[PDB]
Paper text:
Human enteroviruses (EV) are presently classified into four groups, Enterovirus A-D (EV-A, B, C, and D), among which EV-B, the largest group, consists of over 60 serotypes, including all 6 serotypes of coxsackievirus B (CVB1-6), coxsackievirus A9 (CVA9), over 30 serotypes of echoviruses and more than 20 newly identified enteroviruses. The capsid proteins (VP1, VP2, and VP3) adopt the classical eight-stranded anti-parallel β-barrel configuration with the N-termini residing inside and the C-termini exposed on the surface. Most of the uncoating receptors bind to the “canyon” sites of the viral particle, dislodging the “pocket factor” in VP1 and subsequently triggering conformational changes of the intact particle to release the genome, albeit that SCARB2 binds EV71 outside the canyon.
The phylogenetic tree could clearly separate these human EVs into three groups: EV-A, EV-B, and EV-C. Within each group, viruses with distinct receptors were further grouped into mono-phylogenetic clades.
Residue numbers in the entry:
A (entry chain B): 11 to 261
B (entry chain A), E (entry chain A): 10 to 283
C (entry chain D), G (entry chain D), H (entry chain D): 2 to 13, 24 to 68
D (entry chain C), F (entry chain C): 1 to 238
I (entry chain C): 1 to 60
The structure:
């Protein structure tokens, strides 16, 4: 069916033209068991105050646009009380729910690829050098891809067909993905569990997964139609818990 | 049997409302359409299997990971032994096979292939006994030997193997020796909590070093030797498969690249020839 | 100790013997005959089970 | 002691043997396995995933995003082909760099049936019908829709469901085909032709875009591992 | 017992209408006449057997299939390694034994006999360690090494065996690795469907290559080596027996010949002497 | 570990051993066996097949079809032999190149009884009778039909059934004979003489043709494999 | 695992032991003691069974 | 003689075989799987058993 | 005798193997074990003992 509703915390999300819900690699986000845990102290578990939908900034799908990416959970640094527990606790563990919505018309056309890339290590633009943190993820805005080659000395290689990683951009469909076809679809929701090699990790020096939105089939329309087609991203943490409470840093 | 492939059940003509070919990729779903939905097929008993395509049969083949040379000369004591910070990034044929998966957990056999020669110049040997090599593994933080004939070559706790030339290659087994629960091939993050330092997997690689030397002075001439290390991962579990790499590697500590074309060119979009 | 297992032959004296000599589990031979698979996690990672003959949308 | 006799093949190093070896660090305590999601048990779980096919790889389109897109257009139509390529999933400019063809280059032999899924990424008011044909390699490649209707073909009506799976059967005389193919183990051609054509209302974009996907069925198999001819090096990477 | 021969049952005189000697070859039939039909025989218990004349006892003997030489010199990097597209047509003694049958399906053991020497000239070695050889099998389509010390000698997936000189010869087993269901020794046909291209069995031979090299530089002199490959087919089933060949072979990819006489001459048709 | 002791014969390469070896490509999936007709289980199923014997191999007849044909003629007759050759199935100019003698040259010893079948390829109105004799090697070869009637002989009447099997018995003092024979293991001679002669009606061809066949019985055996001295080479074939 | 089979001796302690050490069927020793035969396919490839004593034509 | 014992594996065909070939007890392999301990002799070498929750003095 | 095959890793000296070896002096009579107090079974019985920490290690 095409109508869904996802209620988390004090916030709901209603859609009327939905494809389905892709759920990670099969499993649902849950809490850390006693069989796998290694932190000795008691973990905190804020149910409603942390696990709720946060709406990020809006971008503009232009006719010459090529792609964007957000790195998580760094994109929700100043989003409510989820970002306040990250500063006070040394450890964190959470799953997510990534709702991406872009409605245009019956007369517009286009396509998007919404992947969630775990451990998306990204390559620099000047080889024999290294990126900096200010070039990987902005504070709330989207870092975009470039159609041509990136010339910078400390930026990500933001070419689009190599996906910023050195791999084929068509082969990104292994990861949990949907497609926003403006002919059939309106929104794309992806539920990602906690994917890491360690049971918990500090969510300041480790981007857990990267959300990429890439238009494979570009946007065209007619001059009678609208000329502003925005994309909005709404991400909710799910089953979040923390350890290691100390002073806030930073700040 | 195990683990065979599915058979094609026989099919006749049809006129149905249940069309299986028409689907929707927008849900992020790969279709389960077998050939019996779009054409008439016959009952064949497919006896093929996928034993050669499992994870354990794909990775349990030894590959070279380093090539190290060392002398037996006098002077320049850095050439009298070789060093290796343990990596799986220096030789590309095993680096690309590992980097189809994000995480990996396995045991390993490590085979050392040492092959020597006689160095040229005046005052050659003309009668030499066999050579013997000591291949010491230093876990992270141990005493590093500054040269050959050092106190750190005693190795009361470091595992060392002694090997005379002419016999079978040396081989031992190593368990899953990581700190975490999987060898992270990719690490999207930093080393310091202030988002500064070393971006990438090079901060997670803390496995130790490998040192190899001649335990014999000789006293007449020089003989170089070439240690080649071979890695065979066994008892392998793997998680989160990645796309295979497209651009060629540049560095042994980075995923840095230069942007390459997606495929090789062809003449036309409809180029069924020739 | 004699773990008699079957060899690899193609479907149209097939048994072998194996002893574990060393005291460590990492010393064993490779597990070349574990042929499980579960491709539904990447092919069908949905919340609702999708039928082929029924329409998707 | 016991009298033995060393057979040929002693003191050699075969890279793909299954032998026991003494452990370097004995009685080592390994960290416990945690349930990481996404376990790969077989490489055919990766090749069974659809991935976008660069069928428009005519330079200059391989250094852009236009390699993955198929142009379709308006008037009048149907004396033109949509696309066309040989069926060679391991050795082709089209789809050896896809997810199916990357794992195929690690092996020498392949078998089974290949799926091709086609998404229509035009507007929601655009109609159309196409013919998606596959031809066995016995004869010459087709040049029009009268020669292409005789092979295995489906007819795709674009509507509320915007995808159609053309499932290429496994028709050969051998149980396996080579990955690096030749004139002996050739598989044929895959063509696409206009059935009726695009009819758009006034105020709609006249031209659209089709995307191509490729994956394996549940009877696909590979055999005879080898190294890929895809990546190279000259010296050790520092 | 198995598999013995038939005994001759005893026979007396006879005067019958049932004549077994008179037959008709025109039906394409070889007669079943034992000696007891044309003469008086005695009861002997024949204890002979045909164990030495079976298919498995006839073909399970190793035969040489190639002789390849390679150097350890400087310059001309094609001589630093050897190549072989895998055939059973280059050495005649195994080619003729296979070509009594049309089809063949078997497993195989492959033994490598490497024998070196010292090359002449000035600046000889006078003290050399043992040599070690890498014998890589490349399945059809893999990366071909352009020379020794190449990236393709890593062999993360190609099976390679390393062998020091002085030990037993290297030996491994290979299954029935064909595409079809039998190794076709003969192929009456073409490669292209337009009846053009390569007529004969050379289009069906897609088995890969074999590369052998020295893994050691030496650094003083040159030492040539000679790889001899040996093939022993085991678990053999064979079909459609052919007449043995008469004219000597010329090419390794053809059945081309020059017309030879059917036998050797003799003096007269009635030449019972001497 | 376990104390062993290496016997003589270690690290050698015997070409005809039966040893196990580690597989180069493990867990390989082999194509299934299909029922191809004509399976050879033993080499004696090929040597038991009749094949035409070049008994007329006097040069110049070996570079033509005339080696396989035996001349018989009209008047008067019977002071002439039809043919004659020694019994040496592995080493003879006559029948070492037949189907029986080609497999015999792969072995050193042979035993058993040999069949000789004779087809009369004259006209259907021609009569005739022949004497097909075989002689043990104790004495001199026969020179006429009075010396050739004492050995093992059959009399062949040519009629509606146009073949006769002269079955040479196995008479020797040893259980086996050499293939490359000598004066010790000689087997004797095989002769053929006119009993009455050819009588043809007027209007019929006066001369005819006999063909000779040779195969093994069901008590034939070979032993001691060796290489054939039949094919040679100088260098590797390119 | 101990497949005790009989040795080769001529008709006028004859048993041997054999273990399969490796996990592949192509790794085994040769099947030197399978002595079946069927020469009727080439000697008598007829549609009708022909008797020796009865005449052919 | 076949002393079948268990290998070393981590808690989330694990048996090995061992024969003593020589006639001396010093010829054996190492006793690597004897994991007893008693740390009370150095941690709590008291005459009176001390309770944690009860005060010491 | 018995046909064997030497695997890789033969005639090497791994310092941490567990192999049997023939005794140099056979049938040796060892002195009996007396109950010496203070037996160490594990190295963690030593690390579980409190020891004074030089936290004021500023030279001088
Ligand atoms: C002289 C005795 C030498 C003993 C040999 C042991 C040294 C090797 C130990 C490290 C090997 C463990 C496997 C390492 C794999 C890579 O580090 C991971 N893929 C990266 O995390
Ligand atoms: C360095 C490791 C070398 C591994 C050796 C394996 C290479 C040999 C594989 C091919 C041999 C299979 C038997 C081939 C037989 C002939 O090709 C057929 N008679 C012709 O169809
Ligand atoms: C150290 C290993 C020595 C070889 C193992 C002992 C010889 C084989 C014994 C077979 C029966 C073992 C008991 C079961 O398992
Ligand atoms: C890897 C092979 C080691 C040798 C085989 C174990 C020793 C012989 C055991 C004999 C009894 C095996 C059970 C039956 O078969
Ligand atoms: C000198 C040691 C030779 C090897 C030991 C004999 C072979 C293994 C026998 C296994 C059964 C032994 C009886 C129990 O223990």
């Amino acid at each position: 069916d095409r109508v869904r509703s996802i209620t988390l915390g004090n916030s709901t999300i209603t859609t009327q033209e939905c494809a389905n819900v892709v759920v990670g690699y099969g499993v649902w986000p849950s809490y850390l068991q006693d069989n796998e845990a290694t932190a000795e102290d008691q973990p905190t578990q804020p149910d409603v105050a942390t696990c709720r939908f946060y709406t990020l900034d809006s971008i503009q799908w232009q006719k010459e646009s090529d792609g964007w990416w957000w790195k998580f959970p760094e994109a929700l640094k100043n989003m409510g009380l989820f970002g306040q527990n990250m500063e006070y606790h040394y450890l964190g563990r959470s799953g997510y729910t990534i709702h991406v919505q872009c409605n245009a018309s019956k007369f517009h056309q286009g396509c998007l690829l919404v992947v969630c890339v775990p451990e998306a290590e990204m390559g620099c633009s000047d080889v024999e050098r290294e990126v900096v943190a200010a070039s990987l993820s902005s504070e709330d805005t989207a870092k975009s891809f470039s159609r041509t080659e990136s010339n910078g000395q400390h930026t990500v290689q933001t070419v689009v067909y190599n996906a910023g990683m050195g791999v084929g951009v068509g082969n990104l469909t292994i990861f949990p993905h949907q497609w926003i076809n403006l002919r059939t679809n309106n929104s794309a929701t992806i539920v990602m569990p906690y994917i890491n090699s360690v049971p918990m990790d500090n969510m300041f020096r480790h981007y857990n997964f990267t959300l990429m939105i890439i238009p494979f089939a570009k946007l065209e329309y007619t001059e009678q139609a609208s000329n502003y087609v925005p994309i909005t991203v709404t991400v909710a943490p799910m089953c979040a818990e923390y350890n290691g409470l100390r002073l806030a840093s930073h700040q | 049997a195990v683990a065979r492939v599915a058979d094609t059940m026989p099919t006749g003509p049809r006129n149905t409302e249940s069309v299986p070919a028409l689907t929707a990729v927008e849900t992020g779903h790969t279709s389960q359409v077998v050939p019996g939905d779009t054409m008439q097929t016959r009952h064949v008993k497919n006896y093929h299997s996928r034993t050669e395509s499992s994870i354990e049969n794909f990775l349990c083949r030894a590959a070279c990971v380093y090539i190290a040379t060392y002398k037996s000369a006098g002077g320049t004591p850095t050439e009298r032994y070789a060093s290796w910070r343990i990596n799986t990034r220096q030789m590309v044929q095993l680096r690309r096979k590992f980097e189809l998966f994000t995480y990996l957990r396995f045991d390993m056999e490590i085979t050392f292939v040492i092959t020597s020669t006689q160095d040229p110049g005046t005052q050659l040997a003309q009668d030499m006994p066999v050579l013997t090599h000591q291949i010491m593994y230093i876990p992270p933080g141990g005493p590093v030997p500054n040269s050959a004939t050092d106190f750190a070559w005693q190795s009361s706790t470091n595992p060392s193997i002694f090997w005379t030339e002419g016999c079978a290659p040396a081989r031992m087994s190593v368990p899953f020796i990581s700190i975490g629960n999987a060898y992270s091939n990719f690490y999207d993050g930093w080393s310091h909590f202030t988002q500064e330092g070393v971006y990438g997997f090079n901060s997670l690689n803390n496995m130790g070093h490998i040192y190899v030397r001649h335990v014999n002075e000789q006293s007449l001439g020089v003989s170089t030797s070439t240690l080649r290390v071979y890695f065979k991962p066994k008892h392998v579990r793997a998680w989160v498969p990645r796309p295979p790499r497209l651009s060629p590697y540049v560095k042994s500590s980075n995923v840095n690249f230069k942007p390459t074309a997606v495929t090789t060119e062809r003449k036309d979009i409809n180029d069924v020839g020739t | 100790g004699a773990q008699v297992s079957t060899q690899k032959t193609g479907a149209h004296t097939i048994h072998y013997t194996n002893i574990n000599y060393y005291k460590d589990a990492a010393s064993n031979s490779a597990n070349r005959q574990d042929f499980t698979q579960d491709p539904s996690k990447f092919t069908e990672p949905m919340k609702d089970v999708m039928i082929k003959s029924l329409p998707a949308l | 002691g016991l009298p033995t006799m060393l057979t040929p093949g002693s003191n050699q190093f075969l890279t793909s043997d299954d032998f026991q070896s003494p452990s370097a660090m004995p009685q080592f305590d390994v960290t416990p396995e945690m349930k990481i999601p996404g376990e790969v048990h077989n490489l055919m779980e990766i090749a069974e995933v659809d991935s976008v096919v660069p069928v428009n790889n005519t330079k200059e389109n391989i250094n852009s995003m236009e390699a993955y897109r198929i142009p379709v257009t308006g008037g009048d139509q149907l004396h033109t082909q949509v696309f066309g390529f040989q069926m060679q999933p391991g050795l082709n400019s089209v789809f050896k760099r896809t997810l199916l063809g990357e794992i195929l280059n690690y092996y020498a032999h392949w078998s089974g049936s290949v799926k091709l899924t086609f998404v229509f990424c035009g507007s929601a008011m655009a109609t159309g019908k196409f013919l998606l044909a596959y031809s066995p390699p016995g004869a010459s490649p087709p040049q029009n829709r009268k020669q292409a209707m005789l092979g295995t073909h489906v007819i795709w009506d674009v509507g509320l469901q915007s995808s159609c799976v053309l499932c290429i059967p496994w028709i050969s005389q051998t149980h396996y085909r080579l990955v690096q193919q030749d004139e002996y183990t050739s598989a044929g051609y895959v063509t696409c032709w206009y059935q009726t054509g695009l009819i758009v209302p006034p105020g709609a974009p006249p031209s659209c875009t089709i995307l191509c996907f490729a994956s394996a069925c549940n009877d696909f198999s590979v055999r005879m591992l080898r190294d890929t001819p895809f990546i190279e090096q000259t010296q050790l990477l520092q």
